[PDB]
Amino acid sequence: SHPSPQAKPSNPSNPRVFFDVDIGGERVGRIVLELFADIVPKTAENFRALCTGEKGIGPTTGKPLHFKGCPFHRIIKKFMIQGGDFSNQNGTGGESIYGEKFEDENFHYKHDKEGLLSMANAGSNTNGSQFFITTVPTPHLDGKHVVFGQVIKGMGVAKILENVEVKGEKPAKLCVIAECGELKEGDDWGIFPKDGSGDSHPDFPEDADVDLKDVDKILLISEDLKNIGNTFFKSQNWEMAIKKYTKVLRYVEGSRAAAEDADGAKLQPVALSCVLNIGACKLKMSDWQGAVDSCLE
Incomplete structure (x- = not known):
C-alpha cells in the first residue's frame, strides 16, 4: 500500500474518462477521471467500459453495462461520494463486465487524499460496478477497497456534489451521471460550461491550462x-x-x-x-x- 500519485495524470497512457453531473435537474459540470490501468488494469478496464457502455446489456441485471443516467445514491460530507448502482440505484445492485462480482485486484494505492476513485464492495472479492470518490483522505478503507483512479479535472464539481442536501445519506435532490464516456488522446476536456455562452474557460481555474x-x-x-x-x-x-x-x-x-x-x-x-x-x-x-x-x- 503506497501513496496515491500526485501528478495529474499520473501516467498519460492511463485511460481518461468523464462524468457530466446534474443535480436537481441542473447541469453542474464535468468530472474527468484518470484510470490507473498501469496498476489495476482489470479494475480500470471494468470502470472504463462502464463509462462507454460498449459491453452492451448486463447478463445478471438486464440493464445496460453503463453509468449513463446512474445516480449517486449515498453521499457523506467530509467522507465520500458513492454511485454506480445502475440497476437498483440504492447500493444493492450494479454488476461488473466480467460477471456480477470480481476479485480485489490489489490494494497498491492508499486512500491518502481527496479525489480518489475506489471500488465499493460487500467484502473481499465482491467488486461490481459501484464505486466511490473520496472527498478527504480515507485511511480506514485501505486494504479493504481497491483504489483505481483519481479526479484530474472537475474536483470543484465533486465538491458541489459533496455538499448537496441529504436525508440520512441519500441526496434530497437527484444526483446523477447525465453523461459519461472515454476521452481519446487529444480530445477536448469538455470542461468549459455547456451553456452556449461562448465561454471556453473551465468552470474551475485550477483546471485551466494557464499559470494562475x-x-x-x-x-x-x-x-x-x-x-x-x-x-x-x-x-x-x-x-x-x-x-x-x-x-x-x-x-x-x-x-x-x-x-x-x-x-x-x-x-x-x-x-x-x-x-x-x-x-x-x-x-x-x-x-x-x-x-x-x-x-x-
Missing part, C-alpha cells in the same frame, strides 16, 4: 468572462450574468491562492534558510571579534 499566477492572463480571462456576463446582463438574463460575474471572482481567487501557495511551498523555505544562515554568520563574526578583542587586549 500570471496576472495579465487571468485578467484577459476575467475580461472575456465579464464581457460574456455583460451580454447576459444586456439580455436581461440576470442569473446567467451573475454566474459569469461570479466566475471571474473564482478565477481571481484561484490566481491569488496559486500565488500564495507557490510562495509558501517554494520561496518561504529558501527565505527561512537564508535568515537561519545569516544568524549563523552573525555568530561567527561576533566570535571572531571576541577573539580579536581579548588578543589586542
Whole structure:
C-alpha cells in the first residue's frame, strides 16, 4: 500500500474518462477521471467500459453495462461520494463486465487524499460496478477497497456534489451521471460550461491550462468572462450574468491562492534558510571579534 500519485495524470497512457453531473435537474459540470490501468488494469478496464457502455446489456441485471443516467445514491460530507448502482440505484445492485462480482485486484494505492476513485464492495472479492470518490483522505478503507483512479479535472464539481442536501445519506435532490464516456488522446476536456455562452474557460481555474499566477492572463480571462456576463446582463438574463460575474471572482481567487501557495511551498523555505544562515554568520563574526578583542587586549 503506497501513496496515491500526485501528478495529474499520473501516467498519460492511463485511460481518461468523464462524468457530466446534474443535480436537481441542473447541469453542474464535468468530472474527468484518470484510470490507473498501469496498476489495476482489470479494475480500470471494468470502470472504463462502464463509462462507454460498449459491453452492451448486463447478463445478471438486464440493464445496460453503463453509468449513463446512474445516480449517486449515498453521499457523506467530509467522507465520500458513492454511485454506480445502475440497476437498483440504492447500493444493492450494479454488476461488473466480467460477471456480477470480481476479485480485489490489489490494494497498491492508499486512500491518502481527496479525489480518489475506489471500488465499493460487500467484502473481499465482491467488486461490481459501484464505486466511490473520496472527498478527504480515507485511511480506514485501505486494504479493504481497491483504489483505481483519481479526479484530474472537475474536483470543484465533486465538491458541489459533496455538499448537496441529504436525508440520512441519500441526496434530497437527484444526483446523477447525465453523461459519461472515454476521452481519446487529444480530445477536448469538455470542461468549459455547456451553456452556449461562448465561454471556453473551465468552470474551475485550477483546471485551466494557464499559470494562475500570471496576472495579465487571468485578467484577459476575467475580461472575456465579464464581457460574456455583460451580454447576459444586456439580455436581461440576470442569473446567467451573475454566474459569469461570479466566475471571474473564482478565477481571481484561484490566481491569488496559486500565488500564495507557490510562495509558501517554494520561496518561504529558501527565505527561512537564508535568515537561519545569516544568524549563523552573525555568530561567527561576533566570535571572531571576541577573539580579536581579548588578543589586542
